[PDB]
Symmetry: D2
Subunit: 407 residues, 4 copies
């Protein structure tokens, strides 16, 4: 015995791993690590839900074996073929001598392409298939493009458990298995960060999945990342997804994202920020030299209005701002939102036009003022006052936006 | 005068005129992952008064905020609680701008301000713990808190408005547009409040006991700190309660933290087995590996652990440099003094890291090093070794629970 | 005495500062720090050439004072108004009680806007003005947009010194003042990095400035960054600028720039790399998770061909690759060069089309194969062979490009 | 079989089948700013032979390169010089793929390979310094180099082709498509060759003396290393000459390095004055501040300095944790043993960092701590203090020059 068995509810065990050390994960800055949660269901047909990424294969296998001999597992349910939940299967899928791998057709296709699994036995399920595992039954809820074509939730009607896989997840390494055992506001913070960064462009798919969830009874949501959900905290998590899925998740908040070389665009950004704050909005300033794209997604996600700024560098915007806009564009996080642009230049104003074009045509933001504010080389008190006034207007627009899109 | 700052009246006649340091990430070696702020306050009274200054890069912003409230030549008093650069260094170049002001501080603070910053032509008013400064409707009192955390450290108290200007006290390195804890997630503010305590104040519990004793003697409705958000109502009660428990050594949790570094991951795998053992007792368990952590987080977690473990493979006849740094830091801050502490690690040919860690835990940190052998092994772990690690963790977890029971609030 | 006087040639003293600690400088990764070199000319009219960035004002003033009382300086020549050479003047320009600030009209304009300097005495020079300073005279060579509109070189005909300011510079912190006292190949390395990152888009302006330099005699080039140049090493530095200015600076070299989340685009990149290597080219692989835009500029600068790769992330390329392309585009470093693109996708191939468009229309590279190589989810031996073959073709194209554009 | 690797014949019948690790940036705590490679070699002879393996993540690439030269079932010998994971860990999962191979190594290497990696069904041939392995036209000899840098470390020598397969020996953490030093900037390769020596081998000069003695007895035309580029001709002469000087303690330069950390920059400014003093003597001077440097660079520079200084302000009654790490690392590597060493630093109320640095330099590093007082000051420097620092630097520079003269090659 060198693992602790962790029964979370009667007959359902956490057999995942905590990734204490991960700091960059597919470009997400996981400042608090993550976990790859897998579950063991102690029933007539002993069942494993999901796997883990491949450096942790032996730890995963050890926790399963502590519950049930690997050769007595009957079913391994795979919700999603992504490596963080999957990749252990490439070299380890055989240790489940007598198991059937249970998944949808699209999941089975991706698993084979990724990891091979040439000798595996399959059971291909769908949204009408009911799988008897003894006392319990399992249903399968395809959630295509939430966030992959193969994404699935597994639902146990008897215990009222949703195995939501990436759904309801947070990149959060902890020894606690439930949200309510932590600071719930901290878990909700990471839950929103996960939503912004991974799910941002899939609000429509979320509406569909929440609609399905609303037709069944759920007392527990066991996610594949971070902590799991029950009772009141579970209510909060569901409500946040619900508002987000309807575009009702924004706050009276302005975020300014920028980079700067000699600090003048930064000083203007501070004056604009005070203007926005004067309207009663929360204001956040994110400078790419001290921030990252993961935080840009987090804050733009629930901002009522945004500003992006850069001085002109080599006839365009700074690369860090190009990265941030690419990321926000891909994730659709500012679509329809008031968006302002400003920046210094030395001889030819190019960054601001480029930012404006990207916000308007790329992000489909509400670029209400295409001129923005530009200045040659240095600010002055009058320019600071102009930035402040633009901030007042931006904060007013954020408040009006939130009212228009209110929950 | 063009308007480019928002006036921020926090309570009647008291304005925030500080700055938010959005970008700072390393601050005297503190990993300020969430930035900080240098809070300064303007009191609108018959003698217009400024409390504290800010770090020199932000001087013009600070002066701009003050001038929006009152012309600089009409400021009568600038009260300085602390001479450290983050609240003071703008005075070097800029103090002359307060044409008519007198700088008000204790003798120790004046000595330090002059050595650091010059202020050769400044007008001073030297105060002590018996001085009442009249500023109009309000008066101000001064509470020296020496070595909380500098010899010059002071609090300023206003009896009429029940305000404690606590300077570094009650601070958190937290950049936000919010001025009050209750406007934020209070649990998040408390997390950073604890990180600040662990990293800046850790060795000063006796001085905190003294300071809390004095504060207990007067009514406080507001604590306006010089870093991060300020305190009122219920949230203020929480902040005070944490300092009180910590000053008495009653701040610990049923929690085990393992701090380590590893080169090929075998010391890491043994750490995981130990952690599960500890978790089985009902303790929270945190693993901090120095390649993905930092000394600021080491201080945070060791602060409120009931027990700790430190681990390293042998590298060149000693422990890994990252673990030496973590131990230096923890020793200086006294965070694990008296606490159950365990050590383990791999070696190739000569076991040196674990003996060196044990000696440092026992003689440097003055931890409760109950097992001076620890667990060592050559090159690789086995299932038997993982089991031994797990069992050592169970015992460590039990010792953490015992330590907390003995020191309970 | 707490500074060492550093006479570099008779009557000419280094009075700059070494910035040992700087690691990020206007977005340039200065892994080896930098220096802001200023010079004191001991003549009848004691003269200072350039200033320094503003945290180092007192150290600069101290080294000058060690040579000559600050109130006995007659001239302060300013080549360039950028903060790294300038910004000390804002709060310190007055310490030169009896000095005249000598610069071109555009330099004077930028200095005032930046730093104020309201009480300063000016002498506005131009490309025909000769300034007597005693034994020596100074001439002024405007080098507009090398790299700023105000950029200037100062030339002393008697001593045959070119004070080239940013010209001939390298971000290199050392106690050595001359290239030949270091490892010259190391200095040339940083010299090329500086060229790629700061001067990349100004080859035309470099041809003009080298033409002017070719009309006068230069024994020493005293730069404002890093080490200075004489004799043989000086010949190397001049020759590299000359080739670069004519587009003759490329090597038989292929650089592949990419990011990857799960490593399949990375494995394909390795096979492509071996294909290019087989043709006799040097091959460099730069992965954005372990590289930076400064290194991307360095390597694309002298590559004969390039490849950019990314899997599809949220219907576009990864943000780090968007940043790299923005930067390379701004700097014009791959204009006209063979350029290939490839990458994995899960369901909709978008990164490769976006990379192709950016390379073709943005960078104006020679995108000879717009399809590139794309694959769903995972490589296979046949796909690796396809990547290898594309690499052979890319390396052949790099060699043909170098031959076409040969020195 | 699809073709997706280039065969890379380095010399007649000897092929590079290693991997270039383009992305590695931290390697067992070494800051590998330029990546590395794990070089393995295939010898085309009557008994097809592989020298060394690679780190497990790169196993399939390594096997692909080998298979392009020879089917895996036709490999007769796999020679293992060293059991460390970077050259060996692919064997854990993959060793069975060499169906017909015998693993050839010393007894110590076999013991370590089995403990690390299992290899339960492997066929072994245990060799020693008197064994000649016939592989066809060629024979192979084995040169144990214990503690250069592991107990199992070995070189393999081919007498017919005059090849030394030196494994970690002569290595550099350098990722490049070039296989030979002379195809690169040789000065750059030598820089990294020195960084490798300083960081990996620093404490093993005696073992290097032994190894060079043995190598001197045979003719070597090629040194094929397991990291970075390999050596031939003139460049090979340079590499050998550096190891020779270093093994004899003759590797130092007229060079002073100052290693420090600072919180508010006054210790930093004094460092600059000291550095100018040192520079005035004709020494090169390098300043390394831990917030912008790393222990790998500290090792690099202290390696070939004739004198050093270490500095820190007092933080919580001791030196800054970053400086404790740098000293731990330097102590373990023995890089400043016998070298003139100076200490200085600011303090606020109680001078603790400088005494702690002096004790560590003197008793831990066994440096020549000629002035145990150093320079300390409260809070801030003055022109007089800068002058004192400058003078201490002049003296340190003179002592560096003297140390180099005494130890000259
Ligand atoms: C390396 C560098 C490149 C620049 N390239 C351009 C350019 O292409 N066009 C332009 O108008 N200004 C250019 N500038 C001028 C900047 O836009 C100008 O310095 C501005 O004031 C910087 O704003 P900031 O203080 O926010 O960094 C450049 C400046 C630097 C330092
Ligand atoms: C560069 C390096 C230096 C080492 N130095 C020592 C040493 O001085 N003494 C020792 O007993 N083992 C030494 N070792 C062996 C390690 O302690 C051994 O590899 C251990 O198993 C590593 O533990 P880990 O897997 O947790 O990294 C060294 C290993 C490396 C990689
Ligand atoms: C967070 C994430 C988002 C993705 N978004 C898309 C997408 O928008 N379109 C697509 O075709 N594939 C998408 N993919 C699939 C990747 O392109 C696919 O996993 C690919 O194989 C990764 O290549 P790599 O191994 O080089 O990282 C996404 C994958 C992840 C992990
Ligand atoms: C957080 C912190 C902790 C300190 N702890 C001590 C201490 O334990 N003893 C002491 O004498 N000075 C202490 N000091 C004072 C510093 O040593 C003093 O500020 C010194 O001038 C800093 O040097 P520097 O400018 O090189 O950073 C401390 C300062 C700070 C900022």
């Amino acid at each position: 015995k060198y693992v602790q068995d962790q029964e979370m509810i009667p007959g359902v065990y956490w057999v995942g791993i905590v990734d204490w050390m991960v700091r960059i994960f597919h470009g997400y800055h996981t400042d608090e690590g993550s976990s790859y949660n897998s579950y063991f269901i102690d029933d007539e047909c002993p069942t494993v839900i999901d796997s883990v990424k491949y450096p942790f294969a032996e730890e995963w296998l050890s926790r399963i074996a502590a519950c049930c001999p690997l050769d007595k597992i009957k079913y391994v349910v795979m919700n999603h073929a992504e490596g963080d939940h999957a990749s252990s299967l490439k070299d380890h899928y055989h240790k489940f001598t007598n198991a059937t791998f249970v998944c949808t057709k699209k999941c089975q296709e991706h698993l084979k392409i990724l990891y091979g699994m040439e000798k595996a036995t399959w059971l291909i399920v769908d949204d009408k298939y009911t799988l008897k595992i003894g006392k319990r039954t399992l249903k399968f809820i395809p959630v295509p493009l939430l966030h992959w074509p193969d994404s699935t939730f597994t639902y146990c009607p008897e215990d009222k458990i949703l195995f939501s896989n990436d759904g309801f997840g947070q990149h959060y390494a902890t020894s606690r298995r439930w949200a309510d055992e932590c600071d719930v506001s901290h878990v909700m913070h990471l839950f929103k960060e996960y939503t912004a960064n991974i799910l941002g462009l899939f609000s429509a798919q979320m509406r569909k999945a929440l609609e399905v969830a609303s037709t069944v009874e759920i007392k527990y949501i066991l996610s594949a990342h971070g902590v799991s959900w029950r009772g009141d905290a579970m209510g909060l998590a569901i409500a946040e997804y619900d508002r987000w899925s309807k575009g009702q998740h924004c706050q009276k908040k302005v975020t300014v994202v920028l980079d700067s070389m000699y600090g003048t665009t930064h000083r203007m950004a501070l004056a604009l920020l005070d203007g926005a704050r004067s309207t009663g909005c929360e204001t956040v300033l994110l400078e790419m030299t001290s921030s990252d794209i993961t935080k840009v997604a987090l804050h733009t996600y629930d901002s009522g209005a945004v500003a992006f700024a850069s001085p002109t560098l080599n006839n365009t915007m700074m690369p860090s701002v190009a990265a941030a806009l690419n990321y926000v564009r891909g994730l659709t996080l500012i679509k329809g939102k008031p968006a302002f642009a400003f920046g210094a230049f030395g001889w030819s104003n190019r960054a601001v036009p480029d930012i404006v074009a990207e916000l308007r045509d790329g992000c489909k933001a509400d670029v209400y003022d295409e001129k923005g504010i530009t200045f040659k080389f240095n600010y002055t008190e009058e320019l600071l006052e102009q930035a402040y006034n633009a901030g007042v207007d931006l904060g007013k627009r954020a408040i009006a936006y939130c009212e228009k899109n209110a929950p």
